[PDB]
Each structure stands twice: as structure tokens, then as C-alpha cells.
Design a protein around this ligand. Structure first.
Ligand SMILES: [K+]
Ligand SMILES: [Mg+2]
Ligand SMILES: [Mg+2]
Ligand SMILES: [Mg+2]
Ligand SMILES: [Mg+2]
Ligand SMILES: [Mg+2]
Ligand SMILES: [Mg+2]
Ligand SMILES: [Mg+2]
Ligand SMILES: [Mg+2]
Ligand SMILES: [Mg+2]
Ligand SMILES: [Mg+2]
Ligand SMILES: [Mg+2]
Ligand SMILES: [Mg+2]
Ligand SMILES: [Mg+2]
Ligand SMILES: [Mg+2]
Ligand SMILES: [Mg+2]
Ligand SMILES: [Mg+2]
Ligand SMILES: [Mg+2]
Ligand SMILES: [Mg+2]
Ligand SMILES: [Mg+2]
Ligand SMILES: [Mg+2]
Ligand SMILES: [Mg+2]
Ligand SMILES: [Mg+2]
Ligand SMILES: [Mg+2]
Ligand SMILES: [Mg+2]
Ligand SMILES: [Mg+2]
Ligand SMILES: [Mg+2]
Ligand SMILES: [Mg+2]
Ligand SMILES: [Mg+2]
Ligand SMILES: [Mg+2]
Ligand SMILES: [Mg+2]
Ligand SMILES: [Mg+2]
Ligand SMILES: [Mg+2]
Ligand SMILES: [Mg+2]
Ligand SMILES: [Mg+2]
Ligand SMILES: [Mg+2]
Ligand SMILES: [Mg+2]
Ligand SMILES: [Mg+2]
Ligand SMILES: [Mg+2]
Ligand SMILES: [Mg+2]
Ligand SMILES: [Mg+2]
Ligand SMILES: [Mg+2]
Ligand code: NA
Ligand code: NA
Lengths: 144, 205
RNA sequence: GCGCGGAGUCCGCGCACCA
RNA sequence: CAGUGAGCGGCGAGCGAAGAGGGAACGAACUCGUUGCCGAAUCGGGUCUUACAAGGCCUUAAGUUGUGGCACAAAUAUCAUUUCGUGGUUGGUGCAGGAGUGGCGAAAUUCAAGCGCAAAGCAAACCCGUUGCUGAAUACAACCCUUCAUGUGAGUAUUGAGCCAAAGAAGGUGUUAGCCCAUUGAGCCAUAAACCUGAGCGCCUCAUGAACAAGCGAGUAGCACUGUUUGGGAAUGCAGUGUCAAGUUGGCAGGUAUUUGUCUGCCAAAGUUAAAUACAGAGUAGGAAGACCGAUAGCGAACAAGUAGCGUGAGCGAAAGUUUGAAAAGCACUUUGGAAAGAGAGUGAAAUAGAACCUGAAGUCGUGACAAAGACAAUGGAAGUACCUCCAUUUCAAG
RNA sequence: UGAAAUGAGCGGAGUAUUUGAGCUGGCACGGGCACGCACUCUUCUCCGUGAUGCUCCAUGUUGGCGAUGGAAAUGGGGUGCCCCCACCCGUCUUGAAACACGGACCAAGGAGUCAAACAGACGCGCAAGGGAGGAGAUAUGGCCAGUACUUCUCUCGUACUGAAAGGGAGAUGCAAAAUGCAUCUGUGGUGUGCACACGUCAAAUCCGUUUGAUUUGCCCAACACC
RNA sequence: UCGAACCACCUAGUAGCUGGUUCACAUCGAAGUUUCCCUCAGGAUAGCUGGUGCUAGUAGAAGUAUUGUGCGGUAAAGCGAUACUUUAAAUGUGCAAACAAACCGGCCUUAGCCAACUGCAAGGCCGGAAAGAAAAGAAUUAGAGGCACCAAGUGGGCCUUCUUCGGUAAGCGGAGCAGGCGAUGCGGAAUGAACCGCUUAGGGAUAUGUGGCGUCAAAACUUAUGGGCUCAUUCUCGAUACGUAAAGGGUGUUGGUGG
RNA sequence: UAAGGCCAAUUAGUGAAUGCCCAUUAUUCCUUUGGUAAGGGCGGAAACGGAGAAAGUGUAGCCCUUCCGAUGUAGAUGUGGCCUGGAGGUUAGGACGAAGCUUAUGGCGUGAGCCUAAGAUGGACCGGCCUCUAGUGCAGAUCUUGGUUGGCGUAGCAAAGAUCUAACGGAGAUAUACUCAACAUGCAACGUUGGAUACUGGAGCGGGGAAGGAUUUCGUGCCAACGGCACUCGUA
RNA sequence: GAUGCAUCCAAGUGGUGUAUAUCGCAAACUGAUUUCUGCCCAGUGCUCUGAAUGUCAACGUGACGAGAUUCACCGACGCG
RNA sequence: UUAAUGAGAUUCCCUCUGUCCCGAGUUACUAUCUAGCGAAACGACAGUCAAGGGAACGGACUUGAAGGGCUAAGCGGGGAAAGAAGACCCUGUUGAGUUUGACUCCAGUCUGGCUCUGUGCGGCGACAU
RNA sequence: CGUAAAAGCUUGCUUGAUUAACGAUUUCCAGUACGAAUCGAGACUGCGAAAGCAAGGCCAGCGAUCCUUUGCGAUGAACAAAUCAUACCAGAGGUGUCAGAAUAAUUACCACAGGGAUAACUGGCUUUGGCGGCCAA
RNA sequence: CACUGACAGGGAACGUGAGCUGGGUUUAGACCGUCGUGAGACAGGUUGGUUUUACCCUACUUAGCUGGAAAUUGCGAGAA
RNA sequence: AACGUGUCGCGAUGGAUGACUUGGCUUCCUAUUUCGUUGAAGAACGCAGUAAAGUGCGAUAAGUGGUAUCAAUUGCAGAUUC
């Protein structure tokens, strides 16, 4: 809203906060990102290290669908089991079955302590996650 | 003075703004509600015109491509001639009773074909075909009672009498088996990946 | 930098040129 | 998807898309050439059928240097006919109903109180209250007092009773209107063709549905050089010249060049095609609006505006609301003046509303009264005093 | 002007009280005590009124003027005069009253805006999740270009790292395995560190409790070293 | 209209340069300097300033002393030449002065040192002590420590005191330390950005600072019951600092030393 | 016999700390405003001099008491801070006179401003409060457009020699208050005809044409504007 | 000496000196008559001759390699 | 070097004269006064001096000297008078005209290859043989 | 500046002038980089009987991105082989205007935005050159 | 050179351009020398080349009218 | 004295402000919606009882014919389903 701006407060102050000596001129530094290697070098180097140069191999026609690969951790598995099966679950008995690719996940990672044992179906799994879930009493089944 | 800000890339350096010297290059959406109203009005009028035929033709169920959308399902363009022959239908006749035909699509697996054959049979069991001549009824055509009790399916997808796309069922709970407790699958997965990855170098030597 | 001569060095000639 | 952990870029400034996913639309598909089987079965022109018929008869006119028919991936095969039907998109004659278009078409007070001042108020949420009650305008009119006078336009305003609403929704009418006027439905009438209706319904003519072994588009595609364009990077598309194929055992595409094997998708070099999309200084016939501008604004233009006017010309381009009043009732007549006008008289609520006539600011000027005042430029600050004051407030007797 | 007068000053009670000056009887001070430390003259003393009053305002004496008016009085406004004071505004500039630029008068107009990307601060909703957009559906067929409803998708985030092929994070105990084993109510440790709990200390208090400091336990947020 | 005509359009061309930029009060309040830049009439960067806070309110405080303990080669002094240097100040400058610290004895651990450890090094645990820092001149405080975030103006300076380098000198150029003006009036020096005094909400009373007390002009209505000295004739005796005349003469007058 | 220059006093060998004058400084008193501000009251005691008494950033501040600071260019920030056009709500006003305009009309506010009075002004709309919104505040830009203004009845209207006279025409005169024969109280200027005097001087202020112009040509009227003086006249 | 020299034009069976033809046409310098117009070819210009292989471009030829390539040989004005 | 020619540049002589010594008198039209008509430029506010200090050349400030008001004709000392965002000089990562043995290029001109492009006869080669 | 059985001179043997897991630090300083320098841990060594000393000649002697090129040990996205290209790490080719554009004249025919931040003229300050005086000489 | 008693030196925005003049200096035209490949340069020479406005304020020169001692008022009274 | 200065009452010149709005600007929608040799768009000249511009029209010229309405047009004249 216009009634809250600083121009309203500056009506009557002839210079509007830009000074008498150095004024409000058009483009006193150049336009845009000009000068990044000459007269704005300090700002560029102090706040954006790494900006200039080249690195690594090229990849001409990138498709993200064949690289799709979301991950979920062991101590987050209860997000995918409904609350009625979670309490009934117990090691050495009947366990809920979680299908990762239908919930939008491809890989199971092994961070933390698992809370509800279960059978997990996944495309990929890490070795520590596999070991941990087997020790806790569940299993991993590979899918595609 | 510039401080610590992101380096800007705002891309507005062509003559896009209309002014005294430029026509501009701009697109606004101020007619959006009026166009919404107009489209709905046209749909209702068209339904009344084609009564009692359904507003939308019958379409098959297909699988989405790529490894990201592998697990989804949707409606495709039309039924393949192989599915139509499995259902017992001349494609040229099927085009006249509100079935879409697509001669480009192939059937590479049995289950995808079975689903669509079942769709076609469910539809054919509920079709009510009106006679060409009110005087004489030939073969499988409706009598006059059905012409009296004829209705229009105005559903957004034309799936009233075949239903929506079906999905694979969900596995029920079960117990963990002995071999599953016994050995991991990580090594098996890594072995398959390494076999494919180092194929060629393992075979030249 | 490239070719010719004449006593890797030098001497001439004609050509080449994105740190 | 994506201002992109693609990519292009003195790798600087900057630039910059595609496949997949949710949707809009969708009765969406067809025609030549070629191959095989036929071979004038085709076209034009006369003439006759209610007819320049997709019909008969005649025509060398065109055409065999090829018009036309049948079959080919949604296919199962060539012919063979007579049966029942079908076609309002064969042509000729008729006959309806609808939509559209144009006209016609609704309610309730000019209800009761009268004029400067009660056609105005008070009774403290609601009820009392259909009830009560009551006058500080015995007015005002320019220094003060007496005498004579003169002074209120039109009730859509107030107050009291009452009606209509499936209509309260804006506009007009001499001040602010549901009931003064127009408008608004229900419904009625009239239509050249076209459009919609068991692909509306009859006749005549004319068509015709179902049972009964080879091939696929050549100065083309590609390649070399040059130029240009693209995010396209040992070359994304295109253009010029040189060079110039293959034969479905084939060819093209699979985003890093070459040679060699695999695998996947597709079949260029001929053609037609609705809807969903644009209208960034168009137009025709109608409509609906706005937290926009309000006559130096808003289009240059609210007006005889692309006008008057300017320039040899291409071109350039204003100012200006006519807003007197409810109504012209637009000042008869007398008197001075050559006239314009003046002084009287009259209309009107109002003439200080008298014709470019509502309101009528600032700045500048005239006139009457008053205050003073040397040359100290004027203006200005502070603190008093002389004179004035259409201003305010407080006090008048026991205070 | 006494609407709580705190007074050596206003009240009640008596005549004494105790301040100094002279003069008086162990240690100190100096080589005796000028009179340090301890045990007659000269002045007035003791006692009293809390706020059931949180705040504001209302209280003497004697004259002049004012008895309803072309009144009196106080304040404001106008104009002249006297004494004193006092360089022309805006601007650039180290420096303007400047012989530095702009400046005859008045009216109306006249200059930090709209969009898009990012960030910080503040307000609001939800939270390991948050939120669309486009579009549809039906209330819905001037009101109605609004409001009410919606899937399954998309996007940002819950995980990072490598040029890339790729890989991918708990604790404790035993143990030493180049994928060890066992438990699962749990800050990986150390130093500094709100509040709360347990005791102590000092100050005040109709005196039952406050105001500070401090020991021990656990330490939330946070910082430092591992 | 010509060292490139005229008309319309791209075009509101770009401008580190010149001009302008519209209401009030309140709380705070600068800089002309550093580094880099085809960088010198411009920027970015740190500093100075405002806003917002976070954190256990006296803490890890100080443009200042004292005591203890380190650093120094200028002034002065001296003798290369005919100022270099043994010596050596004043004014400075670094560190410390009991609550995450240091002192006294258990013990644990180290694939640290040592011939070895009951020694040494390091990290911890358990205990003790604690004028919480005496006396000897033996500190003081209008003395609450630390940590972030966001952003403005400025990057032409100038004057003075004491040091100074260049220059014959300059109201000239270049520097060091501090205070000022710029950004600020008020009271004084007749007048003056910077001198002297004092630094500012709107008003009374009392008393002062700098400067004054013959009139102008407030104050000795020309004070004293204080002492000396001075006479000057065309710019002229003299008389408020900062601020705008020398050698040499004089029996003019007043005194001092030695002869 | 300083009102000069050096020194020294404070009413003078009498006997005891300050002769006098002047600040936006110092001390003190009153009022405002703001704080890194500091305390207290806020269950209506009862009865019946006056009223009030809000758990509170900011106000006409909830009410008392107390202490300290207050200037400032460029610049930052705050404000139950002021003002203008329009929207959603709410509450009012107006023909017994809305907006606009005028002022020796006072009152309120530190101020931006707000409100009342009078109009011997006007003739139909509009005010307060809470939210929302913007083409939202002028003294100056050799600023834009309109209108005024001193200079000023001024500078000037000086090449091309020049007119005079009578009669007629015309409102354009011979235009008078007392007194007065006439002068000293109606000036100046014009068209036509006659007469006089001059000029152009045949490379002409003679008579016909082209370019350019387009009714300016003719007659009768008229004299507002135009013919930089004038008109009874005109290419008006 | 016209198959020309100078030269316009985006272009063509396009245009100008040229309706011409060396006593002509095109491009420069000096500036009547009279009397004269010296020396310098080093530089820079202009102009003329060959070494067929001094040097080079595309094209062309041969060899190596599975091929993209790589190497060698040839190569006109001009320059020297 | 040159006769003749020249609104070309220079020096001397004769004639002549208000060019001068050294100014005086006269005319016509103005100015001046009147009737009619009637502008502009410029315009912060204004308008007496001496000395002082000051952005070091004051109308306004400090201390002194003058100064009654209103007018006509002249005049050129001052108003650092008016006229125009200094044409000199410098600055800017501002122009344009012109030059070349400046950087980067384009027409034009010449030269090679391929092509347009046919039919016979010889000669010299090179690859096979 | 420092150094005397040496840091100078002669002599014997040598290559620590190599490599050095991205250790920390100083100078400039924004507490960025570059150049130079200090204290280190590991490998392999030199000299010496030994303790030790040595990763140049103490202190000036040097250089980003992109591109080219050499040394050392993953990719070319439907697969596979051999070439070719590319990638991570470490050096080398250079910017002397040295925190790093690829750059010749002239205008008197001249232009624009500005500058008293800056010259040519008066004025001010200071000196100049003028110019003779005053004591002694 | 000549006269004379004598032919001293200075200041006033290096007094004095809306007072004049315009020879010099300082635009554009043109010639020479030297310099420069060249366009052009020369603190070297030469010839030719628009000099605008006062009617305002003050000052000065002359020319008119007219108030006034509380220097316009108080009645506020001072005689060379 | 006069000229000049200041204040108040009343007049002139001037055309601001307020209220008014058949105009502008901006957004959205609906169609048997797209000119011309069968002579368009544009340009010129004319037409009324009275007629300069503007509007309408074309020698049938401020209009002929048809359908629907139902008593005007209007400055002045002129003259019911005609
Ligand atoms: K005159
Ligand atoms: Mg300010
Ligand atoms: Mg700036
Ligand atoms: Mg600056
Ligand atoms: Mg690379
Ligand atoms: Mg900064
Ligand atoms: Mg335009
Ligand atoms: Mg055919
Ligand atoms: Mg094909
Ligand atoms: Mg081809
Ligand atoms: Mg391009
Ligand atoms: Mg097509
Ligand atoms: Mg307009
Ligand atoms: Mg009027
Ligand atoms: Mg100033
Ligand atoms: Mg993350
Ligand atoms: Mg001309
Ligand atoms: Mg602009
Ligand atoms: Mg421009
Ligand atoms: Mg400015
Ligand atoms: Mg302050
Ligand atoms: Mg400047
Ligand atoms: Mg300044
Ligand atoms: Mg001061
Ligand atoms: Mg006195
Ligand atoms: Mg207070
Ligand atoms: Mg302040
Ligand atoms: Mg505005
Ligand atoms: Mg204004
Ligand atoms: Mg005259
Ligand atoms: Mg004459
Ligand atoms: Mg004559
Ligand atoms: Mg006239
Ligand atoms: Mg003058
Ligand atoms: Mg004159
Ligand atoms: Mg080592
Ligand atoms: Mg390179
Ligand atoms: Mg200067
Ligand atoms: Mg108006
Ligand atoms: Mg078209
Ligand atoms: Mg007409
Ligand atoms: Mg006809
Ligand atoms: Na507006
Ligand atoms: Na030469």
C-alpha cells in the first residue's frame, strides 16, 4: 500500500535521503553484474567464491526421469504404516508390508534405530540398512 | 552499496513492456472465469444435443512409461485391433458405437491386453443399441421399452459403465521366512549390478 | 612456428599468428 | 518440467529449450501416384424428361503420351441377381412443428393537514404511546429611536393514516418518489430462404447395402566447400555451387568423431482435414460492466475536430462545456441622446440570473472614510503604551 | 488562611535536667605537666494528634469598581508610536550578505511508481510436513468476474557427498570381525550456563515473610574444546 | 536550414555531468580516511551512524593511577669533516596484580621423555587452604560483561597548538600528535567560519566567566584617607593579546654599577 | 593633579574573608517532553460538601509521587501524529438552506491543523468514527498553460517637397447659469463642386498583358470592428 | 587501334565520353610573350624481364592406416 | 625579366583644401511643447559617502560624515548594467569532418582450378602389360 | 645488520636446489589473494667417529579465469570392441599499465555536457627588479 | 631636429571602448620559408577582414513647486 | 500642502473553485459476422418554400416503394390508416 512507503515520510525533505554531495544519479556503477572482475572484485570474491571458471564433464541431453531415486531412512518407516498395524506388529509374528515405489521412494537408508519392525519392498537398499532391519526382525524384498 | 545478496538473473532485457514506442509481448488471464463459464455451457448444450449417447467415448487403460511413472495408470488414446479381435469386433463397426480405435499401439504383454479385453466386454454387455428403423428390429437391437428408458452418461471421463482405472492390490501382512532371516539381498543386488557394469572387460580378457 | 639455401649456432629469403 | 548441479557464451555481460506427469478439445479421419486385375465404363457440348438432374438419347469435340472402376495391415480377398430394404447430402414437386427474429403485453396515495414563525417538537433500549403534552420567532431587515410600508417559486421535505410486491432495480418529472410517468414478467400474434425435429413426413425419378502376386514418390536423400540460424556443443535447421545413392537381405532416427557387429522405433522426397489457441493502434450487428478520468483531466477531438490554421511538399495540427431561468415570462411604455446607451417603469422567488448571462477566488485597479508620517529602503523580533474593536468570557448586593 | 498546621516554632505537664568554663584525685607527654586517655558561673527539660482520606477541587481582612446597561472588568484582534535587537532567499562549496548562479505578480498542473527474482525483520495458519497452479464439478440456470467443494499430480522440504562410475550417517556393553555379537525409557563426553528442588548465610519485618548471596542435583537455549 | 538538406519513425536513444524533488513534532546522529579497480568529478570494501535484538543484571570493564617486570637510541652530551658514536633523558610502550585462574597431598590413564621409575610431560578424579587479598601513602569510577542481524550517508576538507621536510618567501606545497570549524548559535575582543569564555527544552530570582566601570554605553554620579614615570608642535605621545620597523644617536628627563 | 604606561588596593596603619556591571554558564523555583526510568493505589470502608477511580506501549495520557536528560548538516527511526480523492461498515446532518467562497469571527492545539460566529454570499448535496485503497500535500526546476503588471500616456508615429479658399452636405454647431453687444466661456477634424497654387515629367502615383491572386469589379446603403491620426469615405 | 582506355550500375543482350576514331578521346602538372630550365634512380612510387620449380592457396598425384586421418610431391599472379 | 592592364600592397612631388593651429555663423528634419494614437528591453528587494574587516574591489554589516518632500531637460562615473548554459583553456573511459607506412574489414582489379565443351590428326610422357 | 679454532680461505665427499598425506603461522592486510619467509610430521638420502646439520645461495630477483601443452591413475546415456575426444590431480607457455582490454594522427571548418575542482587579464599574498639613504668605512 | 625658465617621476580596475578610433594582437580567404609521407603546424614573415542597447536607479549639471523648531503631533511656554 | 504609504466599507478587471456530465479510458461476452470489374474504399460537384457549415440524399436528390405504427412537424410558412 502506498500510504506506508518512505516517500510519504520524505515529503518536504528535498533530497529524499540520497544526500546533497553525492546525489541520486542514473547508473554510477554500471548495469547489472558488470565489473565482477574489475571494480566489484572484492564483493564477488568475499560473498560468492567459486563463481568464475569451469569444472567437470559434460552431459548433453539430461533426462531426470531415469535418474529419479528418492530415499527414506530406517527411523522414518512409521510414516508409511497405518496406526492400527503398527501396534499389532511384533517380532516373531505377522508384520505389515510396505511398498516403497507406491509411496514414492526408491532407496532405503540405514540411519537411526528402527521403531516398528516390518517387511519392506524396495528397489535399492544400503548394506547397513539391510543388516539393521534383519537384526530387528524384518526383511527387505527387492522389487522393480 | 551492494551487500551480501544473490547474483540476479531476471532476464527482462527484450522489449516486452508496451509503451509509446513498443507494442509489447505480454499475456494476461483476465478472461479466465468467463472462459470457464463458456466451456461448461458448451458441454451441457452438447450433451443435450447428443442425448442419449454418452458425451465421451470409451478408452483403454495403459501404463505410464519411464522408471519414474512405472507404477501409475491412466487412459490411452484407443483400443488396439488385437484387443478388438479378442473381443470379437470389427474396428470399423466399433468406431460407430462409441469406441475409440488406435492402430498404432502394440501389445507386448498379456496382462495389459487382458485388462482392456475385460473393459470391452463389460461395455458390450451394457450397450443398448437403438434400431435403425422403428418398424423392424434386426438381431441384437433394443426394443421400444429401452428406447423409453434410455439415459445419458455425462461423466467427465466416460467411465460410468466400465469404472475407473484399476490398480494392483495391496499385499496383506505375513510372517518373515527362514531364508529372509538367513541371508541379505544387498550382496545379490551388488553382484547383478557389477556383472552388468563390468561386462565386456571381463569378457575381452 | 614452416620450408629453402649459405657457414644444435648463425645468416638471410618468402610464409604463419586466440593464453 | 525450468531461469534449469541440461547446454551456449571475449565461458564475460548475458542467453536458454525437450521427453515424461495433471488437464482443454476430440463421433477424426481420409485422398492421389505406385503394384495387380479391367480398359473410355470418363469429361465437355447439344437435346428431352416441371430439371444448364451425379437421369435418358445424340455427339470427334477432349482424351489411349491414359480419363475412370475394383483390392491391398481397421485386409482376407475376382467376378458373378434377385430378394428385402435404405438414402430428404441425386434431381423435380409438396407438407408440417420448433428455435430464432419483429411487434403487442402487468400492481398499489397526486391520500389528509398551508404557509415567515406547530406542514414543528418533547415524553431517556423496548413497552407504555391509537397516550399525554406544548410555543423564548409577540421575528429579522446594518450607528441608535418613531412613522409608513415590503419581504417567502415549484412539496420527490416533515407529520398522520393506508395500500402493492413472484415487481424495492438504476431513468424521467420545477426540492430527496415502491404507489405521478416509463421499464420489468405470464402470455398472444406474424414470418422468403437457411438452421433443428425416429439422419421431420408424402409422391416421381435416380443410386445401392446384407444374407442368399508384385510393389510403395531421384539431380531426391546424403557428402565436400562457403554463408547464415539455433541451447544444439568434431556441426540444430536452411541456402548456393561441385559431387550424387540404396532396393525392405534396404533406408532413416536412437544429442561426442571413425571402422566393425548387435538391438529398439519408424518408412522421407505427393495431397485434404473440424475443435481446443491469437486478435499487442482492424471491421459489421448487438450486449454487459468498472474501488478508472471529471473540462489545463480523460482520446488530439464532451462543441459544424483530423475541423480552423501552417508548410512548394512529405507532413504538422489547436482553442472552444452554449451551465440565463421551472418557464422567454428575453425588459411594453415614458423621457434624454445622431446612435451606442443612460434615467424611470415592468417580468421573475431572484436581474449583483439581462444573453456567451450558475457559482464568481487570487492578483491588479477606482472610490469613500480613517491613521498617521521627515530624510532613518521596506519587511522582521521582544516589551509596553495611545486610540479603536459587528469578538469572547465573567460579574452586578450580599453577592 | 488550617478541608488530617509533626513544630526548640502548636499544644499538655515542672523547675529540674546536662552542655561548657574555672577548680578537683592510674597510664600517656616533655627534660615538670601548658592540663591528652579511663573512672562557682553558664543554659530550659519531658510528653502528644495514621490515612475506614485512592485522586482532584472547594475556607481569611479592609476599601475601589460593578444595582442590567448604548455598563464594568479580563482576555483576544487591529493600527500608530517610543527604547532596544536584527545583513537576501534557494543552491554548489573548506569557506556566501557577497562584485558566485536562479529569483516581476497570481491561479491551476508538476517528480521514488508498477512488475518480476532473492534476502532480513515483524504479523498470521499449519508442521516432518506445507502449499499450489491449471482444470473440473454443482449450489448456479443485475445477484454471480464472487463465494462454497475436489482428486491424483506437481513443487519446496524431511540427506548428503563425488569430475564421474557410484556410495550413503543412533546409543551403550562385550569384542577386535577388511557387512562381529547382545540389549533398546533414550542427553556421545567435558567446561561455562535460566527455572525448579534440597540445604545454608546475611540484611530488613505484626515478625509470616520478603530482598540478595551461596552449596548440592538435574541442567532448557546457547557458546567453547573434543 | 549545409565540414553532410528537409519530413516521419526506431526515440521517453545513453549521460560516472548540470538543474529540480510538495506536511508537523519526537528520540538519536556522521564522514572527507584504509585496500583494490583504463582506478582520479565514479565505484566496491573496512571504519564512523541508525534500527532490531539475543543472553544467567555488576560477569571476560577502563584513551587514568600505583607497585613489580621487559622494550627503545630521539633531545642533551662527545669527537667524521677538519654530522658518525661509546653514554643517555623527559614524554612513551608490552605483560601481571586469587572465583572456568593459581597453591598443598592421594589415586586413575598414556601404543609420551628417560637406562629405569616412586623422576619429568599431558588429561582427569578424590582431599586441604582461602588477611577472597593484611601492614608499609598501598587506587578510583554518573564502573552490567559478552554475542549477532539488517541498512544509510561519507570516501573534494579546512584552521590552530607543539614537532617539522621542500621552497628566497607566501593567506604556498607535504607530513606527525591533539583540539576545533565544517554540522552552532550565545556572551566578549568596535568589526572577522577557526581567538577568549561558555557550549544550547519554555520562563523567573540569585551569583559568576571572559571583558569592563569620562560620555556614546550597564558599572568608581571622574573611587582611595596608594607609590613611581612621561610632554609628544600637519599619518603621530600613548592606550584590549591572537593581529597589519632596525642599526645608531640625544645632558630631554628619571636610576643603577664600578671607579 | 590622565580618561596614558608599571605595580598595588576595596571604602583604608580603625581594629578583622565578598567595591561595582554584563551571559542560552552555575545554584535554585515553576511548567513541558522523553527515559535502559524508580515507587505506590486500583475486592468501591460505612453513612449520605462535590465529582472521579480503566490491571493500563501509544489518547482529552487509569490516578498519584519521585529522579535524570533535552542544541545539531548528511542520514536513520517513531508517532490512538496532521491533511486530500475513492471503497466496505457504522452513526448523523440538509430548502427553518449542502458544497464552494469572504474575514480587525474568536476558541482549541508546541505544531501540521481542527472547530464555532457573521455574510446585508450561494442554491443541492454532505460531516464524524473503524477498516481498505491511491494519479494523495509545492516557493523557486533559464519549469508548463492561462491571466495580470511597473517601465508609461514614455520611446516614438521625421525618405518619396504642399497645400490654400468659398459655397453646399452632415448629429458632427455659431452647443453659456447670474451678469453680460461682440474677443477674453464648443475646440479640433471631414466628403463634393468651383477657384488658386504646386508635383509626376512618356525608363510616368499614364494606357494594356503574362505569372500569381480569385470577385478585390458595378450600383445603392452603412460607419460596430478594420484602413498603427481621422472620416460623412473605403480593396471594410 | 574498339577483343580498346577512362568509367556508371543491385541486376540484364543494361549506361556515359562515343552522332566519336590518334589534327581523336580520357587522366595529371605548370600558367601570355621573351630568355632559360643544371646535378642526383640511393629511398619511396610506377613500370619491364625470367628459375618452373627461392617461397604459397585451392585443386591434383602417391604412399601409410580398419577408417576419421597423416606424410610426401605438384602448384599461378605477387614478393624477393 | 617584362610593354599594356588593376575598386590590388607601398614611398615621394605639384595642385588643393576646416584634416589640423582653433574654432565661428547660417539652413532643412529631429529633439523640445501641444492634439490624436501608443509599444519593447528589462524587473529578487533596493538604491548618499569615507575608513575597517570580509570569498582578500559592500546598497545592506562595524565606527564616523551627510541626508525635508515632489518634479522638467540632459548626461554617460558607478549599478563588477543588458544581450548568450564561454566559440579561448582543462575534464569526460562524449562527438563529428579530414589523413595515414594505426587495429579489424569490404567493394574494385589481377591470377590459378573446376565448369560452360564438340569432331578428327599427330607429338611427349605414366599405369598396366 | 651479522660473523674469527667462523658465516671468511683452502680442501675431501656429495645432490636437502628431491619428495613432502589440502598441518599451523608471519609480512601486505579487508585481517582476501599473489610474492617472500618462519615452526613442523612422514619418505628417501648426503656429510660426520658422534652430538648434529641440510628440503638452495637469510632478508629484492615475479603473475588469475579461459585456451594450448606435458606428466600421472572415470565418461562419450539402447549394448559391445578398437581408435579419437573429454574429465579429476600436478606442472609449463603471460599478461612490466606488473589483482591481468587486442589500439595511430589532425582540426584556424569545428561540436556537446560540464568545470573557477584548472590556464590565459584586473585584484589579494610573497618575491622581483628597480633606488638611492645611514652609521661606520 | 628645433623651442624653452623647464621640457621631473608616478597613482586613479597596468584611470578612462552603452566616450571614440581600430594601426597591432586573436577566426574563416590567400602567398612565402622551415617542418611533416600526409591531413596539417610555426611563441616566423605577409595582404584582406560587421566595434550592438539607456526612455530605469544613483551621481553630476542646470531648471520649477512646496511643507517645516516635539523637525508635520502637546495645549511641551528657553528672544545675542 | 502635493505626491506617496497603511487599514477598513463599496465597486471594476479577471475567470480560479464547487456542484453538474448524451464524452473518454479500461475489462468481458454473443453471432446463418468480413468489400471490389454486377465498378469498391477514397476524391469532386450538386439537392429544402426559406438553408453558410454539419447531417441525410443523387436530376426519382434533407428522399420514391413496402411493413409496422397512429396524429404530428415546428424558427416561420404551407398542407384519420391517405
Ligand atoms: K513623445
Ligand atoms: Mg535533515
Ligand atoms: Mg553515491
Ligand atoms: Mg565527490
Ligand atoms: Mg577443461
Ligand atoms: Mg558499507
Ligand atoms: Mg510516438
Ligand atoms: Mg487412374
Ligand atoms: Mg516411401
Ligand atoms: Mg541434391
Ligand atoms: Mg545467433
Ligand atoms: Mg494443409
Ligand atoms: Mg481535452
Ligand atoms: Mg455570474
Ligand atoms: Mg547562501
Ligand atoms: Mg538440505
Ligand atoms: Mg540557404
Ligand atoms: Mg526520463
Ligand atoms: Mg533525449
Ligand atoms: Mg541540486
Ligand atoms: Mg545528541
Ligand atoms: Mg560538482
Ligand atoms: Mg559540506
Ligand atoms: Mg564556539
Ligand atoms: Mg552609565
Ligand atoms: Mg515525566
Ligand atoms: Mg534534537
Ligand atoms: Mg503526483
Ligand atoms: Mg501553486
Ligand atoms: Mg512627427
Ligand atoms: Mg516628409
Ligand atoms: Mg516638374
Ligand atoms: Mg485609426
Ligand atoms: Mg554607466
Ligand atoms: Mg545617452
Ligand atoms: Mg625430515
Ligand atoms: Mg589459446
Ligand atoms: Mg580556484
Ligand atoms: Mg471547473
Ligand atoms: Mg480480409
Ligand atoms: Mg448548405
Ligand atoms: Mg433519371
Ligand atoms: Na484519483
Ligand atoms: Na616536404
Amino acid at each position: 500500500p502506498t500510504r506506508f512507503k518512505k516517500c510519504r515520510h520524505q515529503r518536504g525533505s528535498t533530497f529524499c535521503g540520497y544526500g546533497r554531495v553525492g546525489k541520486h544519479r542514473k547508473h554510477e556503477s554500471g548495469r547489472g553484474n558488470a565489473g565482477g572482475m574489475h571494480h566489484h572484485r572484492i564483493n564477488f570474491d568475499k560473498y560468492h567464491p567459486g563463481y568464475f571458471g569451469k569444472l567437470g564433464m559434460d552431459h548433453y541431453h539430461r533426462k531426470k526421469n531415469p535418474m529419479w531415486k528418492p530415499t527414506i531412512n530406517l527411523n522414518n518407516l512409521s510414516r508409511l504404516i497405518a496406526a492400527e498395524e503398527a501396534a499389532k506388529a511384533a517380532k516373531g509374528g505377522t508384520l505389515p508390508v510396505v511398498d516403497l515405489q507406491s509411496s514414492g521412494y526408491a532407496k532405503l537408508l540405514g540411519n537411526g534405530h528402527i521403531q516398528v519392525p516390518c517387511i519392506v519392498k524396495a528397489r535399492y537398499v544400503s548394506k547397513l540398512a539391510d543388516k539393521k532391519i534383519r537384526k530387528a526382525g524384518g526383511a527387505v524384498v527387492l522389487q522393480a | 552499496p551492494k551487500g551480501n545478496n544473490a547474483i540476479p538473473h531476471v532476464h527482462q532485457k527484450k522489449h516486452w513492456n508496451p509503451c509509446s514506442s513498443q507494442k509489447g509481448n505480454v499475456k494476461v488471464f483476465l478472461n479466465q472465469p468467463a472462459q470457464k463459464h463458456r466451456r461448461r455451457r458448451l458441454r451441457l448444450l452438447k450433451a443435450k444435443k447428443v442425448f442419449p449417447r454418452p458425451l465421451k467415448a470409451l478408452r483403454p487403460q495403459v501404463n505410464c512409461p519411464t522408471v519414474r511413472h512405472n507404477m501409475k495408470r491412466r487412459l490411452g488414446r484407443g483400443f488396439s485391433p488385437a484387443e478388438l479381435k479378442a473381443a470379437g469386433l470389427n474396428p470399423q463397426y466399433a468406431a460407430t458405437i462409441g469406441i475409440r480405435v488406435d492402430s498404432r499401439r502394440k501389445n507386448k504383454s498379456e496382462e495389459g491386453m487382458n485388462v482392456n479385453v475385460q473393459r470391452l466386454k463389460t461395455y458390450m454387455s451394457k450397450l443398448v443399441l437403438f434400431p435403425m428403423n422403428h418398424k423392424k428390429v434386426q438381431k441384437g437391437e433394443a426394443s421400444e421399452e429401452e428406447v423409453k428408458a434410455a439415459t445419458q452418461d455425462r461423466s467427465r471421463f466416460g467411465d460410468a459403465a466400465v469404472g475407473a482405472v484399476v490398480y494392483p492390490s495391496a499385499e496383506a501382512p505375513r510372517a518373515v521366512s527362514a531364508e529372509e532371516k538367513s541371508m541379505c539381498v544387498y550382496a545379490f543386488l551388488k553382484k547383478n549390478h557389477s556383472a552388468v557394469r563390468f561386462f565386456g572387460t571381463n569378457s575381452s580378457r
